[PDB]
Design an enzyme around this catalytic site. Structure first.
Site, PDB file in Angstrom:
ATOM      1  N   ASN A   1      17.715  -8.646 -21.984  1.00  0.00           N
ATOM      2  CA  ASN A   1      17.039  -9.905 -21.700  1.00  0.00           C
ATOM      3  C   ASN A   1      17.464 -10.495 -20.362  1.00  0.00           C
ATOM      4  O   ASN A   1      16.666 -11.181 -19.714  1.00  0.00           O
ATOM      5  CB  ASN A   1      17.290 -10.896 -22.834  1.00  0.00           C
ATOM      6  CG  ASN A   1      16.545 -10.521 -24.100  1.00  0.00           C
ATOM      7  OD1 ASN A   1      15.846  -9.509 -24.141  1.00  0.00           O
ATOM      8  ND2 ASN A   1      16.692 -11.334 -25.143  1.00  0.00           N
TER       9      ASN A   1
ATOM     10  N   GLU B   1      -4.535 -17.388  -9.231  1.00  0.00           N
ATOM     11  CA  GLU B   1      -4.326 -16.434  -8.149  1.00  0.00           C
ATOM     12  C   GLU B   1      -3.740 -15.122  -8.661  1.00  0.00           C
ATOM     13  O   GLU B   1      -3.959 -14.071  -8.048  1.00  0.00           O
ATOM     14  CB  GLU B   1      -3.431 -17.056  -7.075  1.00  0.00           C
ATOM     15  CG  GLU B   1      -3.444 -16.315  -5.747  1.00  0.00           C
ATOM     16  CD  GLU B   1      -2.778 -17.096  -4.625  1.00  0.00           C
ATOM     17  OE1 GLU B   1      -2.586 -18.321  -4.783  1.00  0.00           O
ATOM     18  OE2 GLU B   1      -2.449 -16.480  -3.587  1.00  0.00           O
TER      19      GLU B   1
HETATM   20  N1  GTP Z   1      13.739  -6.825 -25.006  1.00  0.00           N
HETATM   21  C1  GTP Z   1      13.904  -7.380 -26.201  1.00  0.00           C
HETATM   22  N2  GTP Z   1      13.227  -6.875 -27.293  1.00  0.00           N
HETATM   23  C2  GTP Z   1      13.395  -7.440 -28.513  1.00  0.00           C
HETATM   24  C3  GTP Z   1      14.242  -8.525 -28.683  1.00  0.00           C
HETATM   25  N3  GTP Z   1      14.212  -8.873 -29.992  1.00  0.00           N
HETATM   26  C4  GTP Z   1      13.368  -8.041 -30.643  1.00  0.00           C
HETATM   27  N4  GTP Z   1      12.866  -7.143 -29.740  1.00  0.00           N
HETATM   28  C5  GTP Z   1      11.895  -6.069 -30.000  1.00  0.00           C
HETATM   29  O1  GTP Z   1      10.786  -6.647 -30.659  1.00  0.00           O
HETATM   30  C6  GTP Z   1      10.299  -5.793 -31.676  1.00  0.00           C
HETATM   31  C7  GTP Z   1      10.369  -6.520 -33.015  1.00  0.00           C
HETATM   32  O2  GTP Z   1       9.808  -7.803 -32.869  1.00  0.00           O
HETATM   33  P1  GTP Z   1      10.598  -9.165 -33.198  1.00  0.00           P
HETATM   34  O3  GTP Z   1      10.442 -10.159 -32.069  1.00  0.00           O
HETATM   35  O4  GTP Z   1      12.062  -8.891 -33.447  1.00  0.00           O
HETATM   36  O5  GTP Z   1       9.877  -9.657 -34.561  1.00  0.00           O
HETATM   37  P2  GTP Z   1       9.241 -11.126 -34.743  1.00  0.00           P
HETATM   38  O6  GTP Z   1       8.343 -11.486 -33.592  1.00  0.00           O
HETATM   39  O7  GTP Z   1      10.362 -12.122 -34.885  1.00  0.00           O
HETATM   40  O8  GTP Z   1       8.335 -11.108 -36.077  1.00  0.00           O
HETATM   41  P3  GTP Z   1       8.898 -10.933 -37.582  1.00  0.00           P
HETATM   42  O9  GTP Z   1       8.486  -9.573 -38.084  1.00  0.00           O
HETATM   43  O10 GTP Z   1       8.275 -11.988 -38.461  1.00  0.00           O
HETATM   44  O11 GTP Z   1      10.399 -11.087 -37.597  1.00  0.00           O
HETATM   45  C8  GTP Z   1      11.176  -4.558 -31.662  1.00  0.00           C
HETATM   46  O12 GTP Z   1      10.515  -3.588 -30.888  1.00  0.00           O
HETATM   47  C9  GTP Z   1      12.429  -5.010 -30.946  1.00  0.00           C
HETATM   48  O13 GTP Z   1      13.038  -3.946 -30.253  1.00  0.00           O
HETATM   49  C10 GTP Z   1      14.925  -9.039 -27.585  1.00  0.00           C
HETATM   50  O14 GTP Z   1      15.682 -10.001 -27.711  1.00  0.00           O
HETATM   51  N5  GTP Z   1      14.751  -8.459 -26.346  1.00  0.00           N
END
Ligand code: GTP
Ligand code: ACP
Ligand code: GDP
Ligand code: CA
Ligand code: CA
Ligand code: CA
Ligand code: CA
Ligand code: MG
Ligand code: MG
Ligand code: MG
Ligand code: MG
Lengths: 424, 54, 437, 334
Positions: C228, C254
């Site tokens: 992140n 833009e």
């Molecule tokens: N780069 C990055 N990817 C993340 C992060 N947190 C989760 N992911 C990715 O996001 C995907 C899962 O989505 P999440 O955001 O964790 O799930 P959500 O949007 O909270 O939805 P729910 O299923 O209800 O928990 C996976 O591919 C993870 O690798 C993060 O902090 N940074």
């Protein structure tokens, strides 16, 4: 607070359920009186999943103890951690179930089920966010098998949007109490096919073989068998009891593990199984964890294909080396994983190891080879049913032969369904 | 090449270099989708409770 | 001055937004308590940074941000974090149970119960805008909330703000950090529903960020915190033109004009250089030519793909630090005679360059070293369709057996939405190949 | 234990390579749609390069170079040689060619009329069904019924006895490091008919055309295939020179020139997957011992006698160099 309500029914259900609460209470630092005496905040971060917090900062297991006779539950209350359970959560009758599924499901258990549901309702009402339910029981007896599945059905009616999870101990002639166990198991399996989201198939045949062949115990007792169950139950719930990303709750586990609703019967595995001071490396954990001799279901995984796999490593180890070894096993034996579910193996790591081990690994497999378990039960069922042997114990409680025939057909269909994805 | 549209300021500058010339659904419809799916959930749950009633 | 509202949905969107707003504060000199001593107009103003920050009478600079998650644990971190004083509780919306990595649960079942609350909280921030220009939406593809609830929010924003632009920052699923098998499903489902509603989406493949962290930062097993911080650097360089004085990409419209000549083809490839490990005591500072040449190496892209085997529709070079226009043109001339850069015949072969003299800000105690000059290239190349090809192939494998489909049907979704969404992706892949071959 | 997949069953070369890898005991063949492979022996058409290099914990290698079709198609090769400054239209080892769509018609006619007026050799050849004619109207009418029309080498070096035409096939292997390896063994696919500059059998030296229309098939050499040992001895006996000096220097120059041109476009040096590829270069030799490039084949077959040695060399420098287990090539340096 994503709470889980635990239920243990019958002799086997209460004996393994008691040991489960002893094992995880030690991991979370809870003493036989409910007081916390740990040294890590990781122990308490997810403590409300299985424990209610009472007066004086006491932790009370969210457990309900059910039986149709008082014998085993009196032994639990007399056990080490017997005082930790909520006294009102002891719900028992006096007549017993005579290793009879009909008595547990239709007559004796029907008289007691409503008072059990009153306690389930009391526990669920205080939950800020109830995940679902966790049932421990055997399928070969009468209470855990017959009344346990009646409870599952009535709980689903009252909580249709909650996950139903069971630890189900499968009978084996190697560790057999009565000849009617295949009858009770077959009737119960159809209930589980319809009314659970996740069932861990714990085979007394496999537990016996592990104690005899591997652990070198020539005369295994139920205590020896239940030690394998305790360690397995602790491992498969690690992702629920400690902070983590993968399979952290019951529903997300189900979404990762169950591609088809009826195929939700899991083969659990565990490593190490030592008959003890030697250091176990990450490569050794991974090879043993996937080895058939470490499976708790008495099925050959090389006879089927893995639909989904969940792996949990516990202890202070190199997560880099864990990723490498996990990728190694998949790339080494990619013929045993279905190619139409990409990346179906998920790995979690927990820094806190179980008691007595520096490192451990737990395996949760949804393999089509579990059909061998159901075939085995089916053949033992049919050998007696073709002569209607021992049926009078069941027709005397109101059941008809047609309900047995339907149960026979239901489990043969399940076997066919596993076979269709093993060759797809 | 060619550098065009040079704009400068205290915090930086921007320009363009050219190397070669060339050769919605309504809220009502959205609500219908959301309620249609909720209707299918209620029907699926009613059939389950019906099955359990039998 | 025209304000921009940032929306962070799901775990990935929230945690990335938390990293970005931390970086924005360091770049603009905004302290964690919201105070900004360099801001002389107390309690108001129409400066460039006010596109992202409102101002209270007490001088607090409040992010124009909304955080949404269906489970409270992740946003609770923002409620008690270092920058907890920046936000007021109205900006932080949480639920009880999440979407369980299930697009249908995030879109239909749980999202229906919270969509009106989120829009009400967005309306509160929009009413503080004298000239709102649109929204920046942060979310993952694979999660149930990031995929399912976002597509519902993007549908409603088009209804309530028809004239406003909407930009996405999207996290493409990668098994090395993914937590769900059905993430290919959720990705196709959310791209199909959001496509008509997003004007420009910057896709970030977790695989690419993971390897950049391993290879360029010497991190053995990167965490979300490592990923992140790097993602926030790319997002910051993309949005710096909205937050600082300048003449390139000065408003959200833009971005579409400069990068998106074809609406459905609105996924520009981001490439960032240099990524230097802060663990190295001394490091040779790279020149303008070296960092510009690095923008054409796949190892530095946010999505691993081969632009040499596609065609370009637009290219923006965003420089931060010690960079003069003379050296940029000298670097471009050298690169054109060495690299395979083919534009489509109906587009000019050229680059729009933006230079900001303030070098990139690094989070104190982070993994990235301070650099004299850095660059983010935004190129709309057909080669990014390799990401859609990979995703659609995994979709096809699982869906041919209807694996896990019952989880979606059980939430009220119909099976036909699967194939309808897959046909839309099939048309998307066809569009890219027509343009780039 | 390495893993590989096979996606081209009509490949006689990699059918043997697949057989050799399995014979080593350290390679396991998977199903063609199994993504957890180290090596892909891919298909010819629409190889999914975009799906390679995205398997964590797997070094992946493919037996084709994405973009090498620019060199292995008729119209692509003509356009590449003209447009690339590294080769230029003043390129001296490539016959004067033009791309015609059923476009360079006005340029092809400006050179055709210049030759008929110039009272010099004005015989051309069209291909993509081949037509050899000194009348441009018969060539343009034939295409309308994408092609390229190049100058027909009217003065070819003829082998004696026989007074017959031939062509030289060279096999070139480029590994993941873009090392260019020239197989030391080539073949001369010879016409068995006397060259008559006044029939498409003594003019076309294809192995299938000589085996179906030529009456003297196999009269002089077996299968109308003369190898380098015999051809070098002939050049020494008949022309007082060697195969290395008179021909092979030009061949190595052309191979190096063509592959260095497209190197920045197809190299996998900094790519998430690696590529190698076996090419088949086809040359023509005129009466003055000058070498002309005719075509580059992207999926070539080998000579029967040379299948064993060449396929083992593919395993050595192209496969086992990336996946080590437990010289027949000439490295063309650059
Ligand atoms: N780069 C990055 N990817 C993340 C992060 N947190 C989760 N992911 C990715 O996001 C995907 C899962 O989505 P999440 O955001 O964790 O799930 P959500 O949007 O909270 O939805 P729910 O299923 O209800 O928990 C996976 O591919 C993870 O690798 C993060 O902090 N940074
Ligand atoms: N410009 C030219 N001058 C003289 N002869 C030529 C020529 N072009 C082709 N030929 C002859 O005609 C034959 C056919 O040429 P071409 O390269 O098109 O064959 P081909 O592509 O069909 C089979 P391969 O892929 O093995 O080369 C050549 O082998 C050569 O003998
Ligand atoms: N693993 C294990 N199995 C048991 C235990 N007790 C009983 N069983 C098995 O459970 C079946 C008998 O069921 P039981 O629980 O005693 O009947 P119930 O009390 O009516 O539910 C037989 O197959 C036994 O092998 C135990 O403590 N551990
Ligand atoms: Ca009674
Ligand atoms: Ca009652
Ligand atoms: Ca101000
Ligand atoms: Ca719109
Ligand atoms: Mg008993
Ligand atoms: Mg979440
Ligand atoms: Mg708009
Ligand atoms: Mg050919």
């Amino acid at each position: 607070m994503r709470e889980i309500v635990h239920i243990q029914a019958g002799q086997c259900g209460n004996q393994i359920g008691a040991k489960f609460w002893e094992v995880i209470s030690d991991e979370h630092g809870i003493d036989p009186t409910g007081s916390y005496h740990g040294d890590s905040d990781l122990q308490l971060e997810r403590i409300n999943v299985y424990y209610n917090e009472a007066t004086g900062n006491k932790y009370v297991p969210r457990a309900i103890l059910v039986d149709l006779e008082p014998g085993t539950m009196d032994s639990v209350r007399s056990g080490p951690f017997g005082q930790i359970f909520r006294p009102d959560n002891f719900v028992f009758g006096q007549s017993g179930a005579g290793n009879n599924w009909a008595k547990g499901h239709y007559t004796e258990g029907a008289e007691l089920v409503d008072s059990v549901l009153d306690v389930v309702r009391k526990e669920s009402e205080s939950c800020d966010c109830l995940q679902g339910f966790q049932l421990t029981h055997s399928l070969g007896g009468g209470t855990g098998s017959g009344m346990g599945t009646l409870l599952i059905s009535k709980i689903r009616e009252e909580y249709p949007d909650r996950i139903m999870n069971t630890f189900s101990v499968m009978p084996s002639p190697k560790v057999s109490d009565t000849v009617v166990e295949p009858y009770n198991a077959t009737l119960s399996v159809h209930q589980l096919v319809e009314n659970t989201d996740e069932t861990y198939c714990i085979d007394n045949e496999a537990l016996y073989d592990i104690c005899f062949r591997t652990l070198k115990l020539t005369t295994p007792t139920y205590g020896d068998l239940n030690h394998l169950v305790s360690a397995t139950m602790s491992g498969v719930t690690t992702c629920l009891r400690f902070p983590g990303q993968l399979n952290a709750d019951l529903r997300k586990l189900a979404v990762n593990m169950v591609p088809f609703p009826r195929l939700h019967f899991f083969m659990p595995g565990f490593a190490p199984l030592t008959s003890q001071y030697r250091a176990l490396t990450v490569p050794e954990l991974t090879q043993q964890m996937f080895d058939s001799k470490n499976m708790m279901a008495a099925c050959d995984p090389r006879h089927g294909r893995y639909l989904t796999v969940a792996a949990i490593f516990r202890g202070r180890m190199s997560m880099k080396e864990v990723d490498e070894q996990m990728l190694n096993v998949q790339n080494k034996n990619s013929s045993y994983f279905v190619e139409w579910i990409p990346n179906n193996v998920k790995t979690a790591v927990c820094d806190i190891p179980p008691r007595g081990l520096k490192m451990s690994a737990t395996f949760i497999g949804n393999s089509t080879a579990i059909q061998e378990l159901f075939k085995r039960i089916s053949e033992q069922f049919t050998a007696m049913f073709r002569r209607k042997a021992f049926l009078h114990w069941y027709t005397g409680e109101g059941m008809d032969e047609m309900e047995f025939t339907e149960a026979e057909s239901n489990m043969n269909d399940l076997v066919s369904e596993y076979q269709q994805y093993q060759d797809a | 090449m060619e550098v065009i549209e040079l704009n400068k300021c205290t915090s930086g500058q921007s320009f363009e270099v050219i190397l070669k010339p060339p050769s919605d659904p309504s809220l009502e419809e959205i609500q219908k989708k959301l309620e249609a799916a909720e209707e299918r959930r209620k029907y699926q749950e009613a059939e389950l409770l019906k099955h359990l009633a039998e | 001055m025209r304000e921009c509202i940032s929306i962070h949905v799901g775990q990935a969107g929230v945690q990335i937004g938390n990293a970005c707003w931390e970086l924005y504060c360091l770049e603009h000199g905004i302290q964690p308590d919201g105070q900004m001593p360099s801001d002389k107009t107390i309690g108001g103003g129409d400066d460039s940074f006010n596109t992202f920050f409102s101002e209270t009478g007490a001088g607090k600079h409040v992010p124009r941000a909304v955080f949404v998650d269906l489970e409270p644990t992740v946003i609770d971190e923002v409620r008690t974090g270092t920058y907890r004083q920046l936000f007021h509780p109205e900006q932080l919306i949480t639920g009880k149970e999440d979407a369980a990595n299930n697009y249908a649960r995030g879109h239909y079942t749980i999202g229906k119960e919270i969509i009106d609350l989120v829009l009400d909280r967005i309306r509160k921030l929009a009413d503080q805008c004298t000239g709102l220009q649109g929204f920046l939406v942060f979310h993952s593809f694979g999660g149930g909330t990031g995929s399912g609830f976002t597509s519902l929010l993007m549908e409603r924003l088009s209804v309530d703000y028809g004239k406003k632009s909407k930009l996405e920052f999207s996290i493409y699923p990668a098994p090395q950090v993914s937590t769900a098998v059905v993430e290919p499903y959720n990705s196709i489902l959310t791209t199909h529903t959001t496509l008509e509603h997003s004007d420009c989406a910057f896709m970030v493949d977790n695989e690419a960020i993971y390897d950049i962290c391993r290879r360029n930062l010497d991190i053995e097993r990167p965490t979300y915190t490592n990923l992140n911080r790097l993602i926030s650097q790319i997002v910051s360089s993309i949005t710096a033109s909205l937050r600082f004085d300048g003449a390139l990409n000065v408003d959200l419209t833009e971005f579409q004009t400069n990068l998106v000549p074809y609406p459905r083809i609105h996924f520009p490839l981001a490439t960032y250089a240099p990524v230097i490990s802060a663990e190295k005591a001394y490091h040779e500072q790279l020149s303008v030519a070296e960092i510009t040449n690095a923008c054409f190496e796949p190892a530095n892209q946010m999505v691993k793909c081969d632009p040499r085997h596609g065609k370009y529709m637009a290219c923006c070079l965003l420089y931060r630090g010690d960079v003069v226009p003379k050296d940029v043109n000298a670097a471009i001339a050298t690169i054109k005679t060495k690299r395979s850069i083919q534009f489509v015949d109906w587009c000019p072969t050229g680059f729009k360059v933006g230079i900001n003299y303030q070098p990139p800000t690094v989070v104190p105690g982070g993994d990235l070293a301070k650099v004299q000059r850095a660059v983010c290239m935004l190129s709309n190349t057909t080669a990014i369709a390799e990401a859609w090809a990979r995703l659609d192939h995994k979709f096809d494998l699982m869906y041919a057996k209807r694996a896990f489909v019952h989880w979606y049907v059980g939430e009220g979704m119909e099976e036909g939405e699967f194939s309808e969404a897959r046909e839309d992706m099939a048309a998307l892949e066809k569009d890219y190949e027509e343009v780039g071959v | 234990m390495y893993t590989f997949v096979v996606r081209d069953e009509n490949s006689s070369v990699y059918a043997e390579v697949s057989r050799l890898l399995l014979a080593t005991g350290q390679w396991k063949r998977l199903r063609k749609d199994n993504p957890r492979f180290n090596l892909m022996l891919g298909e010819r058409n629409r190889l999914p390069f975009g799906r390679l290099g995205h398997e964590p914990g797997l070094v992946q290698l493919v037996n084709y170079y994405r973009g090498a079709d620019k060199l292995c198609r008729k119209a692509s090769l003509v356009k590449l040689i003209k447009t690339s400054p590294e080769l230029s239209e003043s390129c001296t080892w490539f016959p004067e060619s033009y791309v015609i769509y059923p476009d360079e018609r006005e340029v092809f006619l400006a050179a055709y009329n210049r030759r008929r007026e110039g009272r010099e050799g004005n015989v051309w050849i069209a291909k993509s069904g081949i037509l050899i004619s000194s009348e441009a109207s018969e060539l343009l009418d034939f295409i309308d019924e994408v092609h390229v029309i190049q100058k027909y080498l009217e003065k070819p070096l003829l082998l004696e006895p026989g007074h017959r035409k031939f062509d030289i096939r060279s096999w070139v292997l480029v590994d993941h490091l873009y090392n260019i390896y020239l197989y030391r063994e080539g073949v001369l696919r010879t016409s068995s008919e006397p060259y008559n500059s006044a029939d498409k059998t003594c003019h076309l030296t294809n192995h299938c055309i000589q085996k179906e229309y030529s009456k003297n098939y196999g009269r002089y050499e077996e299968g109308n295939e003369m190898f380098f040992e015999e051809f070098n001895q002939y050049l020494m006996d008949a022309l007082n020179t060697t195969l290395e000096n008179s021909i092979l220097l030009q061949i190595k120059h052309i191979i190096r020139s063509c592959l260095m041109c497209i190197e920045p476009a197809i190299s996998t040096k900094h790519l998430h997957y690696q590529s190698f590829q076996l090419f088949g270069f086809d040359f023509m030799v005129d009466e003055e011992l000058k070498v002309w490039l005719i075509e580059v084949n992207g999926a070539p077959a080998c000579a029967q006698k040379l299948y064993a040695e060449l396929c083992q060399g593919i395993v050595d420098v192209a496969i086992s160099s990336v996946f080590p287990l437990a010289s027949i090539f000439i490295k063309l340096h650059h």
